[PDB]
Design an enzyme around this catalytic site. Structure first.
Site, PDB file in Angstrom:
ATOM      1  N   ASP A   1       1.286  -9.756   8.097  1.00 56.79           N
ATOM      2  CA  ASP A   1       1.698  -8.970   7.052  1.00 56.79           C
ATOM      3  C   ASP A   1       3.080 -10.080   6.701  1.00 56.79           C
ATOM      4  OD1 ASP A   1       0.351  -6.910   7.005  1.00 56.79           O
ATOM      5  OD2 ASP A   1       1.707  -5.847   8.222  1.00 56.79           O
TER       6      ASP A   1
ATOM      7  N   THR B   1       0.776  -1.399   0.072  1.00 55.51           N
ATOM      8  CA  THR B   1      -0.005  -0.053   0.144  1.00 55.51           C
ATOM      9  C   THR B   1       0.828   1.365  -0.181  1.00 55.51           C
ATOM     10  OG1 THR B   1      -1.760  -1.181   1.174  1.00 55.51           O
ATOM     11  CG2 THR B   1      -1.726   1.391   1.353  1.00 55.51           C
ATOM     12  N   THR B   2       1.674   1.273   0.748  1.00 56.11           N
ATOM     13  CA  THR B   2       2.753   2.525   0.893  1.00 56.11           C
ATOM     14  C   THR B   2       3.684   2.592  -0.267  1.00 56.11           C
ATOM     15  OG1 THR B   2       4.579   1.138   2.139  1.00 56.11           O
ATOM     16  CG2 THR B   2       2.731   2.556   3.525  1.00 56.11           C
TER      17      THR B   2
END
Lengths: 507, 58, 116, 429, 501
Positions: E366, E78-79
């Site tokens: 994650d 996402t980042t």
């Protein structure tokens, strides 16, 4: 007064300015935010304009002609709004010099009589000449897929598009009969064409359901109500005067449902579907009988199943008659899409199908979904309507040419009006070049050179910027578009320009 | 330079700390004593004045 | 405001010629009312004497810099830059103390002897 | 905020460069300037715009001094040097946001300007002053921007033959102020006299007794004055007198400065010529005489021949010539982009931004000519890859001297440097 | 309009992108977020931070729509995509001022993205084709980088193997199909992380009701698996639907089959559980909807709807069922594993505080997404900033060979890739411009290799010795979504915002 006419012209420019980039497959899209907060993005001008709901009265005319454009035709909803609005913009400086609006509005209908006879001369009826059944659908499928990310994968996509329309009646064809569901993940070239319907796999919970998915000839049966016992949402409270009677209070549903458990065994229906969420009571007995069932089925999904095997929906399982049942040729649920999705195959009576697509993202498939609809509408209007004309600016540039010569032979104020009517027709090829990035100044100037040499088929190449012929580019459009657009745009233009007052009551 | 054996200095050509004895960068000793003695007396004049009356604007 | 004019007022004037120290230092424009008589130079003593200063504390710094020019005449800008840094450290010693600086002045004499 | 004060001057400087940017080239956009005295003047020359603009901004006035030195040294490119100066200021805006101190920005321009000259000399064709066929066609193309066209054929050898006599070898800077353009009423363009010795601005005595001619004059035969009885006294002594000498020509005559002294009047001029000074210290100063009927003739001709002497002056100081129109600026941006990887640190990124700042000059020429901005620039990088200096301006007789392109980059490096080095300004009086 | 919205779309994207630039990388910031359901946790994951952002700008809303679909594919990028896509918009703003239409910028980045994929594949390396024994160490050290910023980094040695077996069980070697619905994350308050064990089955949160019931299940004289009964019909006398206002028959049929446990959604009674206590038949009350619809495939048994057809071999069989006491918690849950490979693995993590459990829960989740991309493609690339530098040098060099209008579109794509290593250089305390020029010089004159920005403190280049690798399919998915997002933003030239009532 006279100031209301000018105010109504500029009011339509703001609405038209948004619809300009939406013309063409490569053009920009409008982002509309509904009051419900649901975000929808599409290049089809029909659904777009319907979400504006402009309070201005003259802007409602564009919405009314957009519904008739999508109903009777279905293609060109964006071009009919731009063409109807362009005639009002060119007539703005003519009204400031003292020319009445009636003479200008009457001059538009004069060119319509010459435009109807011009379309009939440009309409060529050809079916089996220099073509065949497979070559007609194959060459026209790669045209709509050009200048897209699927152009490299279009080899496998055309083969699936030809068999899509062949599975349906050629006399009556509907674009809504082919469903498209977005499946995230997987390669874009691994998609296949299915004659049945698929589900969304809404169950993420694990621990039951063991069963092989390979069936021979399953029987399909519809159920109008939900039959279940275990329920995740609600609950039952029990308060009585006896300690041992707390159990039997919630069992009132046993006997009549207990009989319905073996009614399906005697009937033999291997497919059970309902529009309401089904618990684990129905999925219990169906395991040994090899009966497949799916819960939380959408309302639009069951309507496609009824027309598949020709069955009918019944409220209960008791009085179901034997003619309500149906059977397909094969039922196979594969892992295509990295998830098991049920589907039907081999239904001779199926009036609808579903075309599944795959891709790394849902937004990529959405761009492909709207692109496949353009190729369907071309084939949809090529069957019933035998008149096919050259589109993509070809016919548009030809109508403006002849009308310039007819004005020189018509004395009076109609000469400047018809000449301005043909001049306003240049907005269609212009905007198509600006949306694709091509320069509209050089092309429209160089196109008029060979356009006067007597060849009426010269179009605009959408791949590489240059002048060319749409006959080689395989860009075709039905003659119904040019006939319905010129009649709707002229009526909508003369309706707004004749408004001397805007009356709105509040209360 | 904290403890011992430090010939290093400021090198503006390479943008790092290098030995000035090899590059031949030296400054006059009279300039060292003149600036320190002048700056020391300059700071005393301003500190020994507790209150500063606003001068007459011209 | 007595020590503020001799500190904040002097640092504001001291920072004018502070960036001009060295051949790679910064530059400053000196503009007049008519603006057509202006000039550009790297001299620190010229910028201080040309700019009119209404601060009575800044007028003393001009007379102090004239001693270096008459006695030797080299490194005049370096004297003002070093004197401005001494006021930055002396300002932090006062506000955190509020004692007469003459005691701090005696500390500078003992530190200057070890530096020589 | 010491840096924010300088950033306010950079934005004001870029607004001046954008105004002059539209005036570049003969097809550029003119600028209307209304003076406070009521005089209304308009022209596309960037030197005249910045002179009468009366800029009150302290940093923006640096472009006037650079434009003055641009015409005094190279003589051409006063408009393009302003655009190149504003290009480095625009690229330096993103550099300040990254925490880069302007010293590295200013020091890297010195290495970038010296590297751009060595790269430009590799593609430049070295020429010599011994060839008179190249100098005729070089000065004739500069005269195509004026109303005079068919009469400019005889003006080409006039400027060429004057410089070659004083060129000699290794002359370095050649001052064109010693060459004076004499503007007199009457005559035509085809009538011109070189008079290599010297040419004055004044006539002779029209009274009685004046000899007006003397042989072997300097025992003072001829004198100059910056009474009617004094003329009669010196008439018996056979001493020629010339009075009413302009004060502006006093410094001029003290530099360039007789076997024969005579007064030859074509029509109405009544001018005295001197030949064969033969001075050891003083060189051979030549003053060009221009004749014309209307006032607009000798005026427009004066500015046309002055620019032709500047182009020849560039060839004398620096040999070689290149094709104009932003052709060399494209290849320089291509070579510096690939060579930027050979550096390391913050200075390596400056070479990439310096290459993009050199493409504004050829881009503006394509914009002011009506052609598409980005489309023509892409065609420059495409054609210059296979060919070298072949794009065709050589067939169109477009020749820009190499010293103009060299001085434009050199003066821009010093102009942008003097800007970023100012961190503040205060009232000083 | 054209001169308005086109300029505002660039400034609106830089405001949101500059917020996550400080949290990018393991050295970034851990932001405190509170969900409306009452869950409090602290994590640097961008998918959660971006989802909690509520704003009325229609341009920044496209980031949440893309992160929602990307969360299923990867979820950890996402980042990476937002910063990379914002770099393409910065280079696109300069092209608009030069007279280039925005539709050409969309098609220009597509040709540069597909060209850079073939350049990265040539320099890519394979695991199974090089060293097979290092395949175990590649999966162990991959999760160590993401867990180094959390308290998990103390026990990371044991927790690294827990994420390896959880991903393999839900996937096939050739098919490589991993679904997040087959991996669940649960945790409770109390205990420590050292007591966390990998469970091959569901949780069920069962105390076995009355304590006299056996806490462990016996094989019952070498039987087949452990007999379990999945049934929707409980034990209780029925009634009709027309009223609303038998014991020994039903219970004896279950005993003949041998089913130990009976599952029923609603609760039971007191006397109703007394009949099951004498027969050592534990009872299940308050069944959640999570306990059915998949796993039973691995049981290799049958399904009998009613008590009549029950038998010994038609009942689902598992490995064993036991109740293990966890700390001082009175729940006393169970752990059901399986000898054969199942399709679902649920991780179980304990912590001394509720915030610690949720902190290690998403930190371990994650790590499962990183391993998911490593097993999807055997070929991996060197990350840490080396992927963006290598792919940028190939596009910048080939940009001069490609002529036309797209020539400048390729140069902007190479400069946009340099944003990632310059952002990580600022978060690592290094010069972003000096490091970018240093990485390009070492990969040109010396030799072609992959050297990225240093995530941990060191003195020089060549992180290849540390054996830090990133998945090829993970990095390829980021550049495709970033290119598609930049094209999707340019397709909207007008922002329509409806009012309120």
């Amino acid at each position: 007064g006279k100031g209301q006419i000018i105010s109504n012209i500029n009011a339509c420019v703001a609405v038209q300015e948004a619809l300009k980039p939406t013309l063409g497959p490569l053009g920009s899209d409008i982002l509309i935010v509904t009051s419900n907060q649901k975000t929808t993005i599409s290049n089809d001008g029909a659904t777009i304009l319907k979400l504006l709901d402009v309070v201005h009265p003259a802007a409602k005319t564009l919405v009314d002609i957009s519904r008739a454009q999508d109903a009777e035709v279905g293609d060109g909803t964006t071009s009919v709004t731009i063409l109807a609005g362009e005639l009002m913009k060119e007539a703005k400086p003519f009204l400031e010099e003292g020319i009445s609006s009636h003479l200008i509005m009457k001059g538009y209908r004069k060119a319509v009589s010459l435009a109807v006879e011009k379309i009939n001369e440009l309409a060529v009826d050809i079916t089996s000449e220099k073509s065949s059944g497979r070559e007609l659908l194959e060459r026209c499928a790669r045209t709509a897929m050009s200048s897209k990310l699927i152009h490299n994968n279009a080899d496998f996509f055309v083969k699936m598009c030809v068999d899509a329309v062949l599975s349906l009646d050629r006399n009556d064809l509907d674009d809504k009969l082919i469903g498209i569901k977005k499946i995230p993940g997987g390669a874009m070239e691994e998609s296949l064409f299915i004659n049945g319907v698929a589900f969304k796999k809404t169950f993420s919970y694990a621990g039951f359901e063991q069963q092989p998915k390979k069936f021979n000839n399953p029987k399909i049966l519809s159920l109008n109500v939900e039959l279940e016992l275990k329920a995740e949402k609600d609950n039952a409270e029990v308060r009585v005067e006896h300690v041992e009677d707390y159990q039997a209070i919630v069992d009132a549903e046993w006997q009549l449902i207990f009989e319905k458990l073996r009614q399906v065994e005697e009937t033999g229906a291997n497919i059970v579907l309902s529009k309401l969420p089904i618990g684990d009571l129905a999925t219990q007995f169906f395991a040994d009988r090899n009966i497949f069932c799916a819960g939380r089925v959408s309302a639009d999904d069951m309507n496609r199943v009824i027309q598949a095997v020709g069955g009918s929906i019944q409220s209960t399982t008791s009085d179901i008659k034997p003619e309500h049942l149906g059977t397909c040729a094969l039922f196979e649920e594969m892992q295509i899409g990295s998830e098991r999705y049920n589907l039907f195959q081999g239904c001779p009576q199926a009036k609808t199908c579903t075309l599944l697509l795959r891709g790394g993202a849902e937004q990529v498939i959405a761009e492909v979904e709207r692109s496949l609809h353009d190729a369907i509408m071309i084939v949809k209007r090529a069957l019933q309507n035998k008149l096919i004309v050259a589109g993509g600016g070809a016919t548009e540039m030809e109508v403006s040419k002849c009308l310039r010569d007819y004005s020189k032979t018509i004395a009076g104020k109609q000469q400047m009006i018809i000449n301005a009517f043909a001049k306003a027709l240049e907005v269609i090829p212009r905007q198509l070049c600006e949306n694709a990035g091509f320069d509209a100044i050089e092309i429209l100037n160089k196109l008029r050179l060979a356009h006067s040499k007597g060849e009426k088929w010269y179009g605009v190449v959408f791949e590489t910027e240059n002048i060319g012929d749409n006959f080689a580019k395989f860009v075709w459009e039905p003659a119904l578009v040019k006939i319905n657009a010129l009649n709707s745009a002229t009526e909508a233009t003369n309706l707004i320009l004749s408004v001397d007052e805007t009356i709105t009551n509040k209360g | 330079i904290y403890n011992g054996i430090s010939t290093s200095g400021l090198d503006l050509n390479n943008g790092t700390i290098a030995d000035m004895r090899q590059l031949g960068i030296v400054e006059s000793y009279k300039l060292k004593r003149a600036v320190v003695s002048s700056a020391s007396e300059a700071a005393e004049v301003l500190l020994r004045v507790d209150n500063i009356i606003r001068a007459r604007p011209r | 405001n007595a020590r503020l004019s001799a500190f904040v007022g002097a640092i504001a004037v001291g920072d004018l010629v502070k960036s001009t120290l060295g051949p790679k230092g910064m530059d400053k424009l000196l503009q007049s009312a008519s603006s057509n008589t202006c000039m550009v130079t790297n001299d620190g003593a010229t910028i201080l004497k040309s700019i009119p200063l209404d601060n009575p504390a800044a007028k003393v710094l001009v007379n102090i810099s004239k001693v270096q020019d008459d006695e030797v005449g080299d490194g005049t800008t370096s004297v003002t830059v070093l004197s401005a840094e001494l006021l930055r450290e002396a300002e932090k010693l006062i506000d955190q103390s509020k004692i007469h600086p003459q005691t701090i002045i005696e500390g500078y004499r003992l530190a200057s002897a070890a530096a020589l | 905020k010491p840096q924010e004060v300088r950033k306010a001057n950079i934005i004001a400087a870029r607004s001046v460069a954008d105004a002059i940017r539209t005036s570049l080239g003969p097809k550029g956009m003119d600028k209307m300037i209304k003076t406070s005295r009521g005089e209304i003047i308009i022209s596309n020359d960037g030197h005249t715009i910045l002179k009468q603009m009366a800029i009150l901004h302290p940093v923006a006035r640096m472009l006037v001094e650079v434009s003055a030195a641009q015409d005094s040294e190279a003589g051409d490119g006063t408009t393009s040097v302003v655009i190149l100066t504003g290009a480095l200021l625009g690229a330096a805006e993103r550099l300040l946001n990254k925490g880069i101190h302007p010293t590295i920005i200013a020091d890297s321009f010195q290495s970038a300007a010296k590297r751009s000259v060595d790269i430009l000399l590799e593609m430049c064709h070295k020429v010599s002053l011994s060839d008179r066929e190249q100098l005729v066609r070089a000065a004739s193309t500069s005269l195509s921007s004026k109303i005079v066209s068919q009469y400019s054929s005889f003006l080409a050898p006039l400027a060429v033959d004057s410089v070659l006599k004083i060129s000699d070898e290794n002359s370095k800077n050649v001052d064109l102020n010693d060459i004076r353009l004499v503007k007199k009423v009457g005559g035509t363009i085809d009538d011109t006299e070189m008079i290599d010795g010297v040419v004055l601005t004044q006539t002779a005595i029209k009274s009685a007794g004046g000899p007006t001619r003397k042989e072997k004059a300097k025992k003072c035969n001829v004198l100059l004055i910056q009474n009617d009885l004094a003329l009669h006294f010196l008439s018996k002594l056979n001493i020629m007198v010339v009075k009413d000498i302009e004060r502006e020509e006093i410094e001029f005559l003290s530099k360039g400065l007789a076997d024969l002294v005579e007064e030859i009047d074509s029509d109405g001029s009544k001018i005295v010529r001197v030949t064969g000074i033969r001075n050891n210290n003083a060189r051979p100063t030549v003053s060009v005489v221009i004749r014309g009927a209307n006032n607009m003739i000798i005026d427009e001709t004066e500015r046309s021949l002055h620019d032709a002497l500047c182009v020849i002056r560039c060839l004398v100081k620096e040999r070689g010539l290149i094709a104009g129109g932003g052709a060399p600026e494209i290849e320089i941006s291509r070579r510096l982009s690939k060579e930027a990887r050979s550096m390391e640190g913050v200075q390596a990124f400056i070479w990439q931004e310096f290459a993009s700042a050199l493409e504004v000059i050829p881009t503006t020429l394509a914009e002011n000519a009506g052609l598409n901005s980005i489309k023509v620039v892409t065609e420059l990088r495409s054609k210059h890859e296979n060919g070298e200096l072949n794009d065709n301006t050589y067939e169109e007789h477009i020749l820009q001297p190499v010293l103009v392109s060299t001085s434009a980059i050199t003066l821009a490096s010093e102009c942008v440097k003097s800007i970023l080095r100012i961190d503040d300004i205060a009232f000083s009086r | 309009h054209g001169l308005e919205a086109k300029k505002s779309h660039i400034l609106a994207a830089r405001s949101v992108a500059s917020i996550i630039k400080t949290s990018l990388g393991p050295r970034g910031l851990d932001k405190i977020l509170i969900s409306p359901d009452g869950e409090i946790t602290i994590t640097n994951d961008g998918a959660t931070i971006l989802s909690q952002m509520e704003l009325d700008n229609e341009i920044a809303k496209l980031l949440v729509q893309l992160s929602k679909s990307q969360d299923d594919e990867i979820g950890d990028g996402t980042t990476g995509v937002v910063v990379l896509a914002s770099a393409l918009l910065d280079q696109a703003l300069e092209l608009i001022q030069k007279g280039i239409h925005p539709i050409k910028i969309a098609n220009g980045f597509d040709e540069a993205a597909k060209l850079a994929i073939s350049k990265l594949e040539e320099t890519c390396d394979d695991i199974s084709a090089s060293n097979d024994e290092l395949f175990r160490d590649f999966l162990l050290r991959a999760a160590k980088t993401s867990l180094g910023s959390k308290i998990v980094s103390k026990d990371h040695d044991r927790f690294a193997e827990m994420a390896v077996e959880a991903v393999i069980n839900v996937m096939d070697k050739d098919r490589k199909d991993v679904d997040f619905d087959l991996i669940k994350m649960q945790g409770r308050v109390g205990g420590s992380i050292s007591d966390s064990k990998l469970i091959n089955g569901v949780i069920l949160d069962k105390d076995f009701s009355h304590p006299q019931m056996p806490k462990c299940v016996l094989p019952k004289e070498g039987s087949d698996g452990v007999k379990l009964a999945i049934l929707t019909c409980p034990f209780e006398p029925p009634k009709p639907k027309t009223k609303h206002k038998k014991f020994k028959e039903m219970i004896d049929d279950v005993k003949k089959a041998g089913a130990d446990v009976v599952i029923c959604q609603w609760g039971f009674d007191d006397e109703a559980n007394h009949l099951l206590l004498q027969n050592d038949l534990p009872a299940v009350r308050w069944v959640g909807g999570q306990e059915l619809e998949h796993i039973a495939i691995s049981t290799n048994g049958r399904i009998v709807p009613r008590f009549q057809d029950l038998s010994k071999d038609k009942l689902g069989t598992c490995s064993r069922i036991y109740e293990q006491e966890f700390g001082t918690t009175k729940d006393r849950m169970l752990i059901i594993e399986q000898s054969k490979e199942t399709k679902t693995v649920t991780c179980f993590v304990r912590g001394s505080n509720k915030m610690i459990v949720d902190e290690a829960e998403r930190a371990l989740h994650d790590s499962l997404c990183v391993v998911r991309n490593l097993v999807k493609d055997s070929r991996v690339v060197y990350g840490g900033g080396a992927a963006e530098v290598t792919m940028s040098l190939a596009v910048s060099e080939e940009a001069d060979k490609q002529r036309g209008i797209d020539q400048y579109a390729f140069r902007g794509f190479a400069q946009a890739l340099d944003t990632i290593p310059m952002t990580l250089a600022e978060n690592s305390g290094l010069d972003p411009i000096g490091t970018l020029s240093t990485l390009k010089s070492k990969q040109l004159k010396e030799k072609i290799s992959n050297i990225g920005v240093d995530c941990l403190g060191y003195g020089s280049n060549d992180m290849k010795e540390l054996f830090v690798v990133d998945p090829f399919i993970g990095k390829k998915q980021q550049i495709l979504l970033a290119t598609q997002l930049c094209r999707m933003i340019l397709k909207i030239d007008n922002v329509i915002i409806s009012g309120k009532d």
